[PDB]
Each structure stands twice: as structure tokens, then as C-alpha cells.
């Protein structure tokens, strides 16, 4: 789940 | 008392509401309405309008349309949750857990803003594509977003407000019974302090309307499955076209989802 756990950072 | 802590509450949701979502409910029902000096909206009812529309495969590019737009209200629906008190402070693997379920609740949720019986605004209220031609697609794509407007005719009777549906979503995403939260409590915490604050906002931004409250709860369970329903056809559409590429942000959120 990176580009979400991106997105939230 | 704490009432006043629950209208901050409000507030701030609505603002960041306000911020996050270009297109409001009310603007979106303004130009709806034609109640607006705007110039009406580009119509689309069939292959012939959409492109002499797109100025401002058919069935597949429509799709791939509407997975580009999904992509920016992913977006937008993230930038808002960081912004409920206390989101942030959550577990990061909780935030993307309670994201993930959610973002389609709330897409369908804000998605009945932009549409009535017989169609849906879209690029930024600037175009308006109908019902009729969306049903007429050819399967799967046909039932694809029938199901999104059978939802809204019943959704929008309920009438509500910006200012109602900041709240309704701030609860629909902060629900601690997702699959694979780690720390249920802190989520509850503030589910618990959200449906407080949607209690009174309905109370007094609408207090002709008795149990709306319990009205919109019940809503949102319909909308769980509703929300499984379309990860499902999905799922049809990503096996069965070889052709349709699916973004990857939505895979991300599809991927072990119900
Ligand atoms: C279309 C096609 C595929 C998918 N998918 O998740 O695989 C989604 C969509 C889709 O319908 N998304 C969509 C269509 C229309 C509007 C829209 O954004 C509305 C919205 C904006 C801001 C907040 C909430 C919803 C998304």
C-alpha cells in the first residue's frame, strides 16, 4: 500500500 | 458545555470539507437547478455529444475517465481525514486500513451530491453526462454506475447539507470495525466524539426533521455493502478486459478489500 502510505505523508 | 465543543468540531470539518472539495454540494445543486449566472453545462446522451463534448474504445475510455477522476478523489478524501482531530495520530497502518474501506463509501456518499435522476455533473460541474447513456453501455460497463444512482435518489431525499455531510464523513471513515485495525479504542474515541457532533448538527441545522440522525445510520450500512457490490464488478472488470488497465492507486485500495 505505498502511494496511500505516501499520500498520508 | 460540551455542546460547544461538538460545534467546533463542526466547524473545523466543514472548513476542511470546504478546502478539500472544490465542488460543494450547493454549488453542485445551483448548477442543477440552472439557479446559477453560469453557463449550463455541456450535456452528454450519447457517442455523438460525448465527443463533441470532450472539447470541454468508447465504453473503456468513459471508464478510464471515470478511474482518473476516482484517482483525484482519493486524493482529496485522504487530505480531508488528516484533518479530523486526531486521524493523524492514529497508527499510519490504521490510517491506510480505515482509508482503504472508506474511500468508496464516501465517493459514492459525495458522488449523490453531483447527480439526480437522470444524471450526474461532471468535470467540475462543467459537463453533464445522463443516466439513459451511462445504462446504455454495453455490459459490464451498462450497471457499472446504476447502482451509484439508485443510491443518490435515496441518499438525497434525506436533503442534507454540506455542513451535515462534512461530519457523515469524518464517521463513515473513522469506523473500527475495518478488517485488520490494531488499536480499535483511539478510533472509537473519536467515532464516539463525531457522531455526538452529527447528532446536534442535525438537531439544529435541521430541527424541523426529527430522526434524521437515525435515518443517515442506517444509510450507512446499506452503503458497506453497496460498496462491496462495486469492488466485486471490479473485479469483473479487471479479469475479463485484457484490455482495461486499472490504476494502481485503486489497486492498492481493491487488492484483499471484502
Ligand atoms: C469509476 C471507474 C472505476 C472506479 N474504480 O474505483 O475502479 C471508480 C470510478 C468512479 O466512479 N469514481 C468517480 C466517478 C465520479 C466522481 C468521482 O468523484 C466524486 C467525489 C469527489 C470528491 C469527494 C468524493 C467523491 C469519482
Same mark, same amino acid.
Given at each position: 500500500?505505498?502511494?496511500?502510505?505516501?499520500?498520508?505523508? | 458545555? +460540551?455542546?460547544?465543543?461538538?460545534?467546533?468540531?463542526?466547524?473545523?470539518?466543514?472548513?476542511?470539507?470546504?478546502?478539500?472539495?472544490?465542488?460543494?454540494?450547493?454549488?453542485?445543486?445551483?448548477?442543477?437547478?440552472?439557479?446559477?449566472?453560469? @453557463?449550463?453545462?455541456? $450535456?452528454?446522451?450519447?457517442?455523438?455529444?460525448?465527443?463533441?463534448? +470532450?472539447?470541454?474504445?468508447?465504453?473503456?475510455?468513459?471508464? &478510464?475517465?471515470?478511474?482518473?477522476?476516482?484517482?483525484?478523489?482519493?486524493?482529496?478524501?485522504?487530505?480531508?481525514?488528516?484533518?479530523?482531530?486526531?486521524? *493523524?495520530?492514529?497508527?499510519?497502518?490504521?490510517?491506510?486500513?480505515?482509508?482503504?474501506?472508506?474511500?468508496?463509501?464516501?465517493?459514492?456518499?459525495?458522488?449523490?451530491?453531483?447527480?439526480?435522476?437522470?444524471?450526474?455533473? !461532471?468535470? /467540475?460541474?462543467?459537463?453533464?453526462?445522463?443516466?439513459?447513456?451511462?445504462?446504455?453501455?454495453?455490459? =459490464?460497463?451498462?450497471?457499472?454506475?446504476?447502482?451509484?444512482? /439508485?443510491?443518490? *435518489? @435515496? %441518499?438525497?431525499?434525506? +436533503?442534507?447539507?454540506?455542513?451535515? #455531510?462534512?461530519?457523515? !464523513?469524518? *464517521?463513515?471513515?473513522?469506523?473500527?470495525?475495518? =478488517?485488520?485495525?490494531?488499536? $480499535?479504542?483511539? !478510533?472509537?474515541?473519536?467515532?464516539?466524539?463525531?457522531?455526538?457532533?452529527? /447528532? #446536534?448538527?442535525?438537531?439544529?441545522?435541521?430541527?424541523?426533521?426529527?430522526? #434524521? %440522525?437515525?435515518? #443517515?445510520? &442506517? @444509510?450507512?450500512?446499506?452503503?458497506?455493502? !453497496?460498496?462491496?457490490?462495486? *469492488?466485486?464488478?471490479? &473485479?469483473?472488470?479487471?479479469?475479463?478486459?485484457?484490455?482495461?488497465?486499472?490504476?494502481?492507486?485503486?489497486?492498492?485500495?481493491?487488492?484483499?478489500?471484502?
Amino acid at each position: 500500500h505505498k502511494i496511500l502510505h505516501r499520500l498520508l505523508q | 458545555p +460540551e455542546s460547544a465543543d461538538l460545534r467546533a468540531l463542526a466547524k473545523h470539518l466543514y472548513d476542511s470539507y470546504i478546502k478539500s472539495f472544490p465542488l460543494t454540494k450547493a454549488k453542485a445543486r445551483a448548477i442543477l437547478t440552472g439557479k446559477t449566472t453560469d @453557463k449550463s453545462p455541456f $450535456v452528454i446522451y450519447d457517442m455523438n455529444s460525448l465527443m463533441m463534448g +470532450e472539447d470541454k474504445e468508447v465504453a473503456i475510455r468513459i471508464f &478510464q475517465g471515470c478511474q482518473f477522476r476516482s484517482v483525484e478523489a482519493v486524493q482529496e478524501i485522504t487530505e480531508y481525514a488528516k484533518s479530523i482531530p486526531g486521524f *493523524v495520530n492514529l497508527d499510519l497502518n490504521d490510517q491506510v486500513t480505515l482509508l482503504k474501506y472508506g474511500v468508496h463509501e464516501i465517493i459514492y456518499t459525495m458522488l449523490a451530491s453531483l447527480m439526480n435522476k437522470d444524471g450526474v455533473l !461532471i468535470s /467540475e460541474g462543467q459537463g453533464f453526462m445522463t443516466r439513459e447513456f451511462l445504462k446504455s453501455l454495453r455490459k =459490464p460497463f451498462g450497471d457499472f454506475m446504476e447502482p451509484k444512482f /439508485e443510491f443518490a *435518489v @435515496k %441518499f438525497n431525499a434525506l +436533503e442534507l447539507d454540506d455542513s451535515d #455531510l462534512a461530519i457523515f !464523513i469524518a *464517521v463513515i471513515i473513522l469506523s473500527g470495525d475495518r =478488517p485488520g485495525l490494531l488499536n $480499535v479504542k483511539p !478510533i472509537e474515541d473519536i467515532q464516539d466524539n463525531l457522531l455526538q457532533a452529527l /447528532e #446536534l448538527q442535525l438537531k439544529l441545522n435541521h430541527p424541523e426533521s426529527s430522526q #434524521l %440522525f437515525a435515518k #443517515l445510520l &442506517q @444509510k450507512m450500512t446499506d452503503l458497506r455493502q !453497496i460498496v462491496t457490490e462495486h *469492488v466485486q464488478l471490479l &473485479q469483473v472488470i479487471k479479469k475479463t478486459e485484457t484490455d482495461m488497465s486499472l490504476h494502481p492507486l485503486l489497486q492498492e485500495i481493491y487488492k484483499d478489500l471484502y
